[model samples]
Target chain A: EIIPLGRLIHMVNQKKDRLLNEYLSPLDITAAQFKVLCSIRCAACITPVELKKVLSVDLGALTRMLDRLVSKGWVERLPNPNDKRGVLVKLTTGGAAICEQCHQLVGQDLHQELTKNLTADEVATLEYLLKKVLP
Target chain B: NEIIPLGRLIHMVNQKKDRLLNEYLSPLDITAAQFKVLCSIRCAACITPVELKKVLSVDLGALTRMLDRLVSKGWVERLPNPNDKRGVLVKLTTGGAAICEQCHQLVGQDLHQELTKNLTADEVATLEYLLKKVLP
Candidate 1:
């Protein structure tokens, strides 16, 4: 009745995050960490600045994420050869392995889970309305 | 036909919403994240760092960092939880309380309205109805 888009988005985001986290929990990484791995996977390697640009996260927060991934031994950092003072993040063999597995499974699984309650057309309609409403 | 799923579209919309929020809040000297914290403080009862962290899906260090920035602006203050000395309670200062309204009005009312300018009342309702079923 009086639901604002703001509140709906917030709730939906929370629920989606929970669902993804649960699915990824067994992998010992959250959706956020997976996003970092996926970003690095695309380019083989990327600098912190480049990753920040693609991820829409701040440098400080992204740095913290890198630290966690590095500690997990899934990813490592080295000097960005092009940039004298910057570091590039790349997936370790372990990280690459997880990425391969996740890429194959997460899409269909997460998609079905999120839209489970909605009919296929309803999902498409929602996407249309969302794109329309988004300026 | 391959359509973008609800999750990705919703994510895109949220991204746009945040971008517009920052634009509108630029003069107020707050980012989307800071503004959200102020609103959460205003809405919740005796919200603590632990609850805030859980609700916001952010780590302790980031929460503290944002809280520190809010403190620097005199927008929020922390007090020790009397019942539990180790716990911290967060609330808006008078400055924060009033400023929160202005900011909320900017995004909550003005910006939201603008965001849905392309939709009719029926479409809005339909979108809401569809979104309601997306999760549960």
Candidate 2:
């Protein structure tokens, strides 16, 4: 017997974690780091907690990802004026450049794999449904 | 003088991530999680990582794309898995199953090679198991 759709939903999410982490090879990137980079590039100046929300990653994981990115020169965290302990994150120019260069093919192979059986309509519908599910 | 509007917010950023990831995967003939499917299926048997976030539904359209890519490569297929007619859900086939086994071997070996340089065998296994656990 299957669990509720909610449980099933979570199971799929867990599987995605496995899938994305599996492909950390062939590139100088990790899944968490890529997510941080993307968030910074998008927000230009998001706080660490804010990033946790945007990326939906755990705080501890977010901390480590940010630390690694900062060390690698992809991201910089600065003091937030409003909150002493809070730090705002920004993409370094180098990071932005990397995102620009490596953005393509990030999921090229995976995209091809997932859509392997769909018709044009099924593909379009699935895309629309996923978008509808969340913000 | 302005914070990014709440409306232009996550959706816009996410859209960018989506487009870029797809672009990156274009040459590889797969996307992020499609590789996961090949890997997961290879190691396991008869499972599809549908909208279930325990698997990761960043977007099933994204998942759908990965499925399509695999189908094109002959790695995965969609048959009715006893579902609630609840919506469009899919399953893996024999050929798709075989390919998943094969591709997963390649994917796992390559992935281990990539991160192994930075992590120990224990660490790698930990990450994998942790992911499988924490994802849900």
Q: Among these predicted structures, which one has the highest TM-score?
A: 1
The parts of candidate 1 lying over 4 Å away from their true place are A42-44, A133-135, B117-121
lDDT of each candidate versus the true structure: 0.82, 0.54
In candidate 2, residue A108 scores what lDDT?
56
Model 1 chain A poorest ten-residue lDDT run: A102-111
Model 2 / residue A51 / CA error / Å:
1.6
Candidate 2, residues B6-125, lDDT tens digits: the string is 112223434433344444445546654564566555554545555432444345445566667777776666555575454444556676666556644444344335323455555444
DockQ of each two-chain model: 0.69, 0.04
Model 2: docking quality category = incorrect
A19-126 per-residue lDDT for model 1 (tens digits): 777778777778888878988998988998889767666678788889988888889887888886988889999999988887666667877888889888887788
* Candidate 2 residue-wise lDDT, A48-79, digit = tens: 88886666544665787688888888888878
lDDT of 2 at B88: 45
Instruction: Compute the interface RMSD for each candidate structure.
Output: 1.5, 16.6
How far out, in Å, is residue B79 in model 2?
A: 42
Count of clashing pairs, candidate 2: 67
The C-alpha TM-scores of every prediction are 0.87, 0.45
lDDT of 1 by residue, B33-107 (tens): 888888889899568998998877776788899999999999998988998899989999999999999887766
